[PDB]
Symmetry: C3
Amino acid sequence: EVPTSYNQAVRRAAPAVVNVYNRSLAIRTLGSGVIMSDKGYILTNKHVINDAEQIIVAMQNGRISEALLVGSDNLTDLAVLKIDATNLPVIPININRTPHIGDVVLAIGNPYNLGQTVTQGIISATGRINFLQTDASINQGNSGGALVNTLGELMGINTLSFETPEGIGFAIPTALATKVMEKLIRDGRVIRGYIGITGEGIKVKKVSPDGPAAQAGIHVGDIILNVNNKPATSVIETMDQVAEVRPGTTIPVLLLRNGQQIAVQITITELD
Amino acid sequence: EVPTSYNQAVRRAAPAVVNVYNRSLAIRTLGSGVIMSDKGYILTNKHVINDAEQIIVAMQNGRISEALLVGSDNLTDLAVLKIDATNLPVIPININRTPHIGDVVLAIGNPYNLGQTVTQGIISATGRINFLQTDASINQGNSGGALVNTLGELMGINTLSFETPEGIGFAIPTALATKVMEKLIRDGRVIRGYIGITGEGIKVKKVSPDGPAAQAGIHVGDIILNVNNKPATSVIETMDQVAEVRPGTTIPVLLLRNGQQIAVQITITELD
Amino acid sequence: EVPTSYNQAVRRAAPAVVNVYNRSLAIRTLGSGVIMSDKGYILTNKHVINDAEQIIVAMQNGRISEALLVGSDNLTDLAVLKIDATNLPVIPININRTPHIGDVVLAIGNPYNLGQTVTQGIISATGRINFLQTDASINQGNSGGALVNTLGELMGINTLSFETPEGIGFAIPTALATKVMEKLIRDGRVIRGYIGITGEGIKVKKVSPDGPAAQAGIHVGDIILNVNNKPATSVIETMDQVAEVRPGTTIPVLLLRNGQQIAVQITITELD
């Protein structure tokens, strides 16, 4: 008796989704952003704001503001902007809502600078490399905008679209995005731990010179066994681990060097 | 317990959506149409029927009829056809239903001459230049067909689809489409008012020769202030206004000509 | 109050949708498959497994198995695989569920070897040449996977995707797919009847040499009237009929040969 509609989601979330314009000596590129906090913090993708000399944020209520850059993270392609904090709409965030495959979602952004657009699809996959996959159509200009469920709750920040493939696009999920945002607000960057190692236990195909591995006693050909008390079998898994250790933290490692077992103290520096 | 389906919408609306074939000395192009009235009036897009020597309408019940052209409008890309009025299904129209962003919609038409197809998406934007935007997939052959909500009510007439962009397509909304239809039925064309002016108050970059501006006392460089008692600041806004005035209507205008204020009577002719 | 989701369908059906890898002397091509029976029978598309030297099936629970080929059918592009039958999830099948235009559907498969993906759309058309059409996005890798409704019931086996067309993709409907599967299990192929005739009653533009028509007394130019007691007007209709007759079945036919009516006994062989 009533038409099926996700307009309530749109009314809840779209006022917090902004149009982001990267200007330099006119518009160099453009995209979208999401108002995360009533203090004026906005998430967007780093590739939207790269090389900006001036960052303009336009709200759907027609307010236009200049933005400051709080910080950015190349590894997640996120950036935080800050605008004047008066009477801002904020995106709905439900910290208890896990994105499930098949959840209906809406992507909200500014594809082709047509003005704010809302497209619909579902959560197609999760865990993709930390990505959500979706077939809500995402186009150039959508980057940095919101993927929301039918309650308007933020599911992720839309980032990129994959014969021409159809209906394959990706978003950084909310939990990760918000964690990156908080680190950027606090530290002005995402502090990750670094070890100077390229690998495929794990073989050190290459040590990094000036790399806490080399300057620790580690050399090529080794097999690392334990990294800070944890077996080190998979590279992504082990690099994810190392990322987590604070810099200036002094960890034990365990290596095999020609059929013997030498524990190594390496001290974690900050990744560049 | 029951599968989710919009089949009721399809059962209500698809019998009124036709396949339109533009023939000349075999098929030159094809598209779709919508039966608007039980008297046999059909909306389609003008680009579907341009240069037709014969217009064939096929209904989903297998009836095939030849159509007459009632009229067409280049500015909205609409045309009205007329077929024999026996026992026709008519599209549902709810004059009170406003299309809202996020409303689920179905596009019904004949993409690639595959036979009648129904695709699903949402209302993505409204007000686009008077367009609805949708991510219900629209392809070549869909032009002229129906965009309906999940009750089967007509939301608009599908017109065109915008790396390859995905999920961006446009429809003329029902209220506008029906207004154009009524004018075409009544007058055989859409009568618009015309003033001979190109502008960007508003500067007259160019007067049109034989243009009621020039033949009224208006000249290049002027700034027009008021058009028929209304400030004239924006061009689209002011051209939309002029369009509305009936031809042979004699309106006051107000211009600035070198720091003085001369009221001008211009008489509105019909646009070609 | 609850987000709209088709996750229940995904939880019911996706565990039975597999990733299929065609290996030869590394991966030659890949796609998807559907577990049809707890005995280990899997449907996929023939084009996925063509020329395979080894067929690997990966389940979403991480089990990896080698598959045997039960048989395949070029005309429907289907194949049946067999894996070890321990504790398999099976796709939901409702023999009473007819696919209706507008039914919401989910396509489940392995596009671009991203890992199992679920996309959403509707049933766009049925009866297409026996195909379902859908705008659930289908990409390279989806072939052989499941199209399910929102209860998780199998609607069809996804086969191929049709300016770039958007949202046009095809699946073999469940009833047909299951019938082909049963014939492949039973006979190792789909046994069809054959008559040696190319036509457009029906004119025999070409007889097939060694073709039960020619070796029956039939010749070019004839008009066939009745095929086994049924008027023979349409070619698809009449070829569909002939397909149904078992080989070694001896049927009457009726032909016109220059204004006279000669009944012909032809004996149906098996198509190659």
